[PDB]
Amino acid sequence: KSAALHIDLCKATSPADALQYLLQFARKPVEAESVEGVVRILLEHYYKENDPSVRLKIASLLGLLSKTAGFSPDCIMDDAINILQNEKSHQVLAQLLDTLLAIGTKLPENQAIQMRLVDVACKHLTDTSHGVRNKCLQLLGNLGSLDVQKIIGDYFSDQDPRVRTAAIKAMLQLHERGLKLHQTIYNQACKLLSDDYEQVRSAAVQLIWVVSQLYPESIVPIPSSNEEIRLVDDAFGKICHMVSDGSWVVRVQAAKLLGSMEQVSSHFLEQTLDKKSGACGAFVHGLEDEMYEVRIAAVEALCMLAQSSPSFAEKCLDFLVDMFNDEIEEVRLQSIHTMRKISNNITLREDQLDTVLAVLEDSSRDIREALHELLCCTNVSTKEGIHLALVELLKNLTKYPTDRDSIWKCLKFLGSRHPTLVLPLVPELLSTHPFFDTAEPDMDDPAYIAVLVLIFNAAKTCPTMPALFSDHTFRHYAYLRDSLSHLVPADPSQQFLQQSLERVYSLQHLDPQGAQELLEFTIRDLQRLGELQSELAGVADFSATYLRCQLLLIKALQEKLWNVAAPLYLKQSDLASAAAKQIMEETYKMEFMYSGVENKQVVIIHHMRLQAKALQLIVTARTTRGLDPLFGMCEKFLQEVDFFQRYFIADLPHLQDSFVDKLLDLMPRLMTSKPAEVVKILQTMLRQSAFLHLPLPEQIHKASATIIEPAGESDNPLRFTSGLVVALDVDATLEHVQDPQNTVKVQVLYPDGQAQMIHPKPADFRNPGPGRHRLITQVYLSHTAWTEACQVEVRLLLAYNEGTIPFSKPVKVYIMPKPA
């Protein structure tokens, strides 16, 4: 429709509605040859129109069409630079430079066109408009000559701050693309660091950090002194001064870049945490800033610099202790985490230790857990401090019994890493009288296990005094070794599954009764194998469902209805009609509740689906007296077979003697056959069809779902006003679901016929692990008045591309709509 575009642009109007037509055209994709055609037409129409807005829209649409996927833009660059040659409007010129930047970015390999484009950018950099200079600097930054550094350094000193930011970001892009920068850049960015604009200062401090990282060991002179300073130290001082900026995002940027200057000398590192050149007190100022983001960024800068420099961590220590009590919870979480990170070899003295143990008493569980891992990773002398830590942990356990596992982990790590210090404390912890026979302490009392976990982990690395234990302490040691062994210290199935499957396959020549008996035996064995080997459970019930499909097919094909005529057929004792429906349900369950399926299994699944459809066709043909509905779904079945041969034509030569290839042999007869004869030949040809083989997947699991938050074991009704809503929270443990975002659905079933199906949003499908998903929705329930609190049925469902199948355990919730 390129000629339609030509006609509509040159035939309706010039000034205004042409812009509307271009706007309407810009919203549809164009194929690459048609991209070339419309580019030629629009560039021909560019010279005709003298309206600048129409030409701006033309330039934008050229830039959009140059970004199409399959279109190589090498043939349109010359006309583009030709229309830049005689373009006077600055906005249209800026849009044209944007188009040229898209052209250059789409073709990185061609060096000649890149040199041409940077020549155009260098030509147009002297434009009076700031937008043209901005786009030309972006063009130089994106392409360059990896001369360009000198020109961008010249444009660091432009009058417009936007052009200055464009130049700094362009040369940062040059460094990021791979180009190595000069050193005069450092002086220019140092001059530009005191700019009156926020964005210029942020870009300049980024450039200062980059040029410091490029040449850390370079020696530069002080402007006001004879002494010489390393480049990384001087840039560290500049960024430390930028930490005290008036803009909070500039402070965050300065702190974050300050964290990555690991090559700074130690002297400036002790300077930056002091309170008495320009680096003095930078982190002290950053840790007390009003914006919590700056404090967080200074915390990570402290963490990185203390990980780099071990002598810095001792100075970091007391500031982290002071900033544990911070008004923002995320800030104190970060402070505790970084304190744990930098606690590799430094010891805690008394006041820092009991400040940590004082903030252990906090009501938030998150910082309590974080402080628990800090106590796991802490090193401490002065064993009375260890006793104080144990007392504070025990009273935390009394105040918060839910954290007993974390507290036991703390005491395991404290005993395992401070063995000699716990050793004199043992008679004070275990109430061991020197001569009295002490009463046996109550086991399963979480304070006493907490003491024993500390003691036993101390006794592991020190065998000097394990004889301080009494007899009941040794008995409790045995009990904890049996129960808490992770804390206290001191393929036949696959072969059987293959053998059972090949036993089924190799005995497919028996009588129908023997085949049913063999299939029942192997289904029972596969079910019990799934109940025994957990990692083979998915493949076990996968093959069990396949053999159940085959068993249902065999039992349906050996019914008493084939021995009676069509008028004498009676459906009130029928079995095959339910069998075909069951095979359909099992095939859908097989295809969609199994994670490890592939095409080599989907083809057999669809083959069994075809066999079930044929069986249902013959069953329905038994009970139909009219000729045209039978002909109708016979034609529908042959259409389904044609769709199957079209979709799965690649792996057709693997299904020897099966249903579908024996259909394909008789297919030209099948189009020309009378539909009752088609039904008869299908009935006689299902019984002669050979049983297929399942290619076993390497890794396959059932999609499992259980909900725990409705918790259908409480008989207390959930009361609300009739006609209003009541909210129900669910917590689903989805296991091995491939795409739970678009397949898992919540079904609520009221006691009447209402079966409202709820689609959860993707925002609350939490993924805490590989193959593990968590579903937390607040489903909404409403109905009018009930005379008694009946029930409601909550069920998870799996949806596929046409129907839905049950997915989880049915759970009943009591609901009592009271009248208003």
């Binding site: 399963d444 045995a478 009990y479 049996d482 129960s483």
Partner: protein, 87 residues
Amino acid sequence: QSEKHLEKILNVDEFVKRIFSVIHSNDPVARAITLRMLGSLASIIPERKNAHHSIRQSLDSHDNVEVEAAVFAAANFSAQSKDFAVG
């Protein structure tokens, strides 16, 4: 005689605790009867670790009735718990 009804008591912890309190009796006959209780209750207290420890300790006792009751309790708990079975 009431094994099918003891799955519907739901105050399991204090009931089992007050039965289990007389595993510490010095009488070996009382210890044997409690081991037979634990084996009888093994359907509703699997993975109950103090019961496992009591069975393991009573298997090494010097009284024949207590050892026989510990064997009976171990046979019951091994059927209902795989963590008991592996050790």
